[PDB]
Amino acid sequence: TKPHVNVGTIGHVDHGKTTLTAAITTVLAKTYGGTINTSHVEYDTPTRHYAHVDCPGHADYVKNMITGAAQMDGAILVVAATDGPMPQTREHILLGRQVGVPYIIVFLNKCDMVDDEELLELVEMEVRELLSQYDFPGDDTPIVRGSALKALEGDAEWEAKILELAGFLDSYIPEPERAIDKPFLLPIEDVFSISGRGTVVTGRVERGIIKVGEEVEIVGIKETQKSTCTGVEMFRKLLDEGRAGENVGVLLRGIKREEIERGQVLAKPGTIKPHTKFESEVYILSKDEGGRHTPFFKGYRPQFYFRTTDVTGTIELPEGVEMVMPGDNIKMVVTLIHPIAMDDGLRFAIREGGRTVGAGVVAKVLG
Amino acid sequence: AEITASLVKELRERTGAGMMDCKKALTEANGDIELAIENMRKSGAIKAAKKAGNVAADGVIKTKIDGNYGIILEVNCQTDFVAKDAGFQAFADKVLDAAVAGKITDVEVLKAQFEEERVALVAKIGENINIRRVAALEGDVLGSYQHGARIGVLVAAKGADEELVKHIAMHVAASKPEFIKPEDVSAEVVEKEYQVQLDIAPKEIAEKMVEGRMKKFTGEVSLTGQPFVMEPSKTVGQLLKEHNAEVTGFIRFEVGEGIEK
Ligand SMILES: CO[C@@H]1[C@H](O)[C@@H](OC)[C@H](O[C@@H](C)[C@@H](O)/C=C/C=C/C=C/C(=O)[C@@H](C)[C@@H](O)[C@H](C)[C@@H]2C/C=C/C=C/C=C/[C@H](O)C(=O)/C(C)=C/C=C/C(C)=C/[C@@H](O)/C(C)=C/CC(=O)O2)O[C@@H]1C
Ligand SMILES: Nc1nc2c(ncn2[C@@H]2O[C@H](COP(=O)(O)OP(=O)(O)NP(=O)(O)O)[C@@H](O)[C@H]2O)c(=O)[nH]1
Ligand SMILES: [Mg+2]
Incomplete structure (x- = not known):
């Protein structure tokens, strides 16, 4: 089966999030070979399969950043070794804490423009201090140096820093199997109205177990409505019951698009x-x-x-x-x-x- | 006297951005921080944000009003817990109570007077304790404001009632001032700032609007020119026309800063 974990880049604007993503795949692909719907990337370390998603580091583009941050069980903080920590670097981290994000690995990108060693220690100290402040195990957080750009083409040395990083993906980040064993809960991402099926709401299962045929409890914005789960389907294929951690859809016989809206909570009756x-x-x-x-x-x-x-x-x-x-x-x-x-x-x-x-x-x- | 680690460190601490960019701009200033800061602002890459000598330590700030005489001080401890152990927090009051009653503006006197209890408390709590500074302010109607333990502020005036003097103190603690009116600004400060705005580059038609930016800056460093915090729709130099008053002096204390007369 080979367990897989959703990850993704994160950090300040044009520090090198996307180019690192390109580096990780390119390197891992030329090295080995043998649950996410957003524009993502996939690569395999000999240990795990990885679903990676790049997020824009602008202060305004925190939209699909938080959406991505939620789905990923591990974040890859991209910090420029030159510029160092920037508002968005710490903006993302704190938002990371608020929106789950179990663990965090730092990549000191653009490390090819730092000859002065004392400068490397300063940013590492400053970075490690940031997440230590925002309730993250900073004092023992893997910080990998190296460059993404030089690792993109040639350079067995800079490519090794990528393999090093991916090594910590398997090393630092454990299996996030723990999720269920508690009352069901799910937020709404969108409300669709299909003429054939009916009305299916979306959203990632925050926690709990949902089986097709049970009741619900629509709580939020308006009134505490209640319907019945007609069916659960992922992407395009059906689903017998349902497991937490994944993002699916639930239809409600009797509830249309105008009756329910985005932002409500579906849970076990009385939780x-x-x-x-x-x-x-x-x-x-x-x-x-x-x-x-x-x-x-x-x-x-x-x-x-x-x-x-x-x-x-x-x-x-x-x-x-x-x-x-x-x-x-x-x-x-x-x-x-x-x-x-x-x-x-x-x-x-x-x-x-x-x-x-x-x-x-x-x-x-x-x- | 060249480039050290703690050199480029502080520069960034008062810049807010660009780690390696600091050293590059610092070495262009041949080691001088204030020259680098000027060049960095004149580069059109720095949103000013100059925080003069950010020590970034940890301690307490206490204040005590007494009619005409108001004394404020700064007592640096160690961890944030030491500042809130109620033993050292009360010790600082003990230093304050004897400072106010003695009207001391000489911090060296407080040193020896409380050096006995200092070592006694240091050896009892295991934390190095020090009294940094203390100043005073004379005025008709005094008023203080303790924005937590990190920041304190003393404001004296003549005409403002018991509430009006407090709301002004909150503004001083908030929007960090440096003068009262745009008139009482040192020409040494204006001229050195004038060279910064002027070095931003229209010929002889943009020079006049640049000197107009000085008039917005003089209101920014002042207090009467600064906009209120409770309602920024209006300034402050038009707000002293409430109960007909005028501010005499200002004192702002934050755990850190300093090193300036
Ligand atoms: C087939 O047609 C249709 C469609 O095409 C198909 O979709 C592919 C669809 O397929 C279905 C069957 C099915 O397979 C598809 C299912 C789809 C599921 C989608 C799931 C998701 O997006 C989830 C990650 C997100 O909501 C996720 C919960 C959301 C994602 C939410 C992101 C929010 C962003 C807001 C940002 C603010 O500007 C901001 O500035 C700011 C700072 C906000 C504060 C945020 C905080 C701090 C929130 C916390 O309170 C917290 C912990 C939030 C977590 C949270 O709510 O994550 O069928 C349809 C019918
Ligand atoms: N020398 C060097 N340049 C790099 C490195 N990583 C990124 N860059 C440079 O940084 C710039 C932006 O890269 P990019 O990957 O798009 O950053 P980003 O984090 O994806 N930006 P965003 O998150 O906003 O989309 C490019 O000019 C690229 O050459 C690196 O390791 N070394
Ligand atoms: Mg990007």
């Missing part, structure tokens, strides 16, 4: 519940993190993002604080206008007109 007012910790992004530039107060009306949907909520900070600055991280209460399914231990994010505001976890639900 998760919708809320508008919640308790949270909330970190706040700074300038070096590509976040807020000016401080805000108790009159803030931004755009909150939960799972696949986004809600507009207010603020309510504890009696003792009156201002939040780009870099703060104080626990507080937010009241949303739309009820969204949540529980104790949900990582979300806040955004407002390009500038990605901070992100925190949900302490306890309320109303």
Whole structure:
């Protein structure tokens, strides 16, 4: 069978994410040979098969980046050995923590323009400090040097740095088989209306086991609706039951396109519940993190993002604080206008007109 | 006196970007940081962002108001836990309480006075503790604001009530000022900044709008020229016309910075 794991590049803009991806395949293909629908790439180390997806490192193109970050069980941080860590480098990492991403491997790209050794130690220290701050095992995170461009054509030396990297893919990243054994849960990515079949919603199974023929519990944005699972199909082929970690579709006999919408949660009848007012910790992004530039107060009306949907909520900070600055991280209460399914231990994010505001976890639900 | 590791390190710490780019621009300045910073801004590749001497240490900032005399200080500890063990956090108050009552602007006096309890606390907590600096501010109506433990701020005025003096302190802690009005800006600062804006290159028709960018900069480094934080739709030099007042002085303390008179 040979187990396979979804991975992908990640990091600051044009540090060399795509060119590394080209390098990894080209090298692994000329070396050996013998669950993702987005524009991806595939290569095989003698240990595992790998489903790799490149993401753009621009601050604006964090759209399919987060989508990709969710699916990958391991991220390949691309940091320029020259420029070093940049806002998006740490932007991606923190977002990585919020959106799963079990493990992380760093690739010091563009290492062919660094003669000064002391400069290599500085960026490695700075990088390793970043993910150590954003709740990632930085102090013992594999950081591989070398170049992607020089590894692309010829150079058995720079090609070895790629094989080295891919070696850590098998070494550092373990088998992410652990997922189910808990109540079912799934976010909605899109709502389609087929004239022959009916109405099939999409989305990756976050956790739990879904079998064709069971009930559901549509929770989110509007009312707590309930239907029945008519069938589950992947890509184009059918499916008997269903396994978590994969991304499929579920039809609902009686529910059409106008009845259900993107961002809701399908779960086991009596597990998760919708809320508008919640308790949270909330970190706040700074300038070096590509976040807020000016401080805000108790009159803030931004755009909150939960799972696949986004809600507009207010603020309510504890009696003792009156201002939040780009870099703060104080626990507080937010009241949303739309009820969204949540529980104790949900990582979300806040955004407002390009500038990605901070992100925190949900302490306890309320109303 | 050439290129060291800690040299290019700090330059980036006050730049925000370009690791290897720093050393390249630094070696062009033959080792001088401020010359490099000028050249980097005049290169049209730096969004200013000059943070003067970022020490990036860890400690506490405490303040205490007392009618006309207000004393603020900085006490550097070790880990973030040391700053919140309530023993050292109260120790700093002990230093503050005797500093305010003694009205000390000479930090060396506080050193010897509390060197006894310092070593006694250091040996008890196992953490190296030090009192960095302390300054004072005289004014009619004082007001302080403790934005956490890292940042504190003292603001004195004449005419603003008990609430108005606090809201101004929050702005000082937020939008880091450096002067009151655009008028009281040192010509040494203006001229050296003038060479930066002027070196950005229309002939003799873009020079006049560049000197106009100075007028936006003078409001940016000031406080009356700076826009409010609670409502940036208006400045501040038009906000002292509320209860008819005027700011006397400003003091901003952050764990780090310094090395400047
Ligand atoms: C055949 O026709 C049709 C179609 O073509 C077929 O599709 C190929 C289709 O095939 C089906 C049968 C079936 O095989 C196809 C199934 C398809 C499944 C698709 C699944 C996915 O996209 C998933 C990865 C995503 O949603 C995934 C959950 C999503 C992906 C979500 C990405 C969100 C991006 C938002 C970014 C903001 O600008 C932002 O600036 C910002 C900072 C936001 C904050 C984000 C955070 C912090 C969220 C967390 O709260 C969290 C943990 C989020 C995780 C999350 O929600 O991941 O059938 C149709 C009928
Ligand atoms: N010398 C050298 N140049 C490199 C290396 N990796 C990338 N580059 C250069 O970096 C530029 C952008 O490369 P690219 O791979 O597109 O970066 P990216 O991370 O994919 N960009 P994005 O994520 O926005 O799509 C190109 O000019 C490329 O030559 C490297 O290892 N060495
Ligand atoms: Mg790319």
